[PDB]
Design a binder for this molecule. Structure first.
Ligand SMILES: *CCC(=O)N1CCC[C@H](n2nc(-c3cccc(C(=O)Nc4ccc(C(C)C)cc4)c3)c3c(N)ncnc32)C1
Length: 263
């Protein structure tokens, strides 16, 4: 699982943000890869290195694969399966108007398949959103970044009261207590379905973190996107039940969404 730096070539930068840079590159005797270089102080590298072997052994066609870690020199690098069409959020936004409702449901089905595998494996994603789903060949969607917020060091992103906390995808028990579970991932999956069927609109656009907490706690829920059928919006609302016990598991969601798609 440890990749020697001499086994990697960096060709072109494809993305950058808070936490680091992503390059298109090549991994010796293997394939084209996406390489993430980590900025110093952005992650607990030691905690990640402890968990890396387990994360790499997780394998499913609907999960973006971690191929290994280049840790011999600072900054460290993480090597991933290259996803030709980038993130789902931008893929939807840039191609708005070019999607059939069936295609959007099929994208949700792909994510649900990956999530049902994580649920069975007792892996909590913690931050499921269209921005971390990736698009491959033939519009296949894969889930990435499951469990990665465990390693983020900026308490403003990880604390439920942090100024950068991703509250838009958080269930009430997550924004209140950081009580993560596959059922809090189900809430996030409902928000992801809304992002997909709204063709990449930002959920609770213009609402502050405090406003999202108050609105959700008082029963507000995201409106029905134009492209979501009655049945699809009913499933979204089931993901947003206040009590995690009342939300469907991903095993149940996978069958429900497949039944809707198959007709
Ligand atoms: C919407 C996202 C975006 O703008 N794009 C375009 C630029 C390239 C981006 N991209 N990211 C990955 C990728 C997949 C899986 C994991 C990662 C990753 O870096 N995860 C991660 C690493 C460290 C941390 C710490 C700070 C804890 C958090 C998360 C990145 C791509 C792949 N595999 N292919 C293609 N483009 C990819 C998407």
């Amino acid at each position: 699982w440890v990749i020697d730096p001499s086994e990697l070539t960096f060709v072109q930068e494809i993305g950058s943000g808070q936490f680091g840079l992503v390059h298109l590159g090549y991994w010796l005797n293997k394939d084209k890869v996406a390489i993430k270089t980590i900025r110093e102080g952005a992650m607990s590298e030691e905690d990640f290195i402890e968990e890396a072997e387990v994360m790499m052994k997780l394998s499913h066609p609907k999960l973006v694969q971690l191929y290994g870690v280049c840790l011999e020199q600072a900054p460290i690098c993480l090597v991933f399966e290259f996803m030709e069409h980038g993130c789902l959020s931008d893929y939807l936004r840039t191609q708005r108007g070019l999607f059939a409702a069936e295609t959007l449901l099929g994208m949700c089905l792909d994510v649900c398949e990956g999530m049902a595998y994580l649920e069975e494996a007792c892996v909590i994603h913690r931050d499921l959103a269209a921005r971390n789903c990736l698009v491959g060949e033939n519009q296949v969607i894969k889930v990435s970044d499951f469990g990665m917020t465990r390693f983020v060091l900026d308490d403003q992103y990880t604390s439920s009261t942090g100024t950068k906390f991703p509250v838009k995808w958080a269930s009430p028990e997550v924004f209140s207590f950081s009580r993560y579970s596959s059922k809090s991932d189900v809430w996030s999956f409902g928000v992801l379905m809304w992002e997909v069927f709204s063709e990449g609109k930002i959920p609770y656009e213009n609402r502050s973190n405090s406003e999202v907490v108050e609105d959700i706690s008082t029963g507000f829920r995201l409106y029905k996107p134009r492209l979501a059928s009655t049945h699809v919006y009913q499933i979204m609302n089931h993901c947003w039940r206040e009590r995690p016990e009342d939300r469907p598991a991903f095993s149940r969601l996978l069958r429900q969404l497949a039944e809707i798609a198959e007709s």
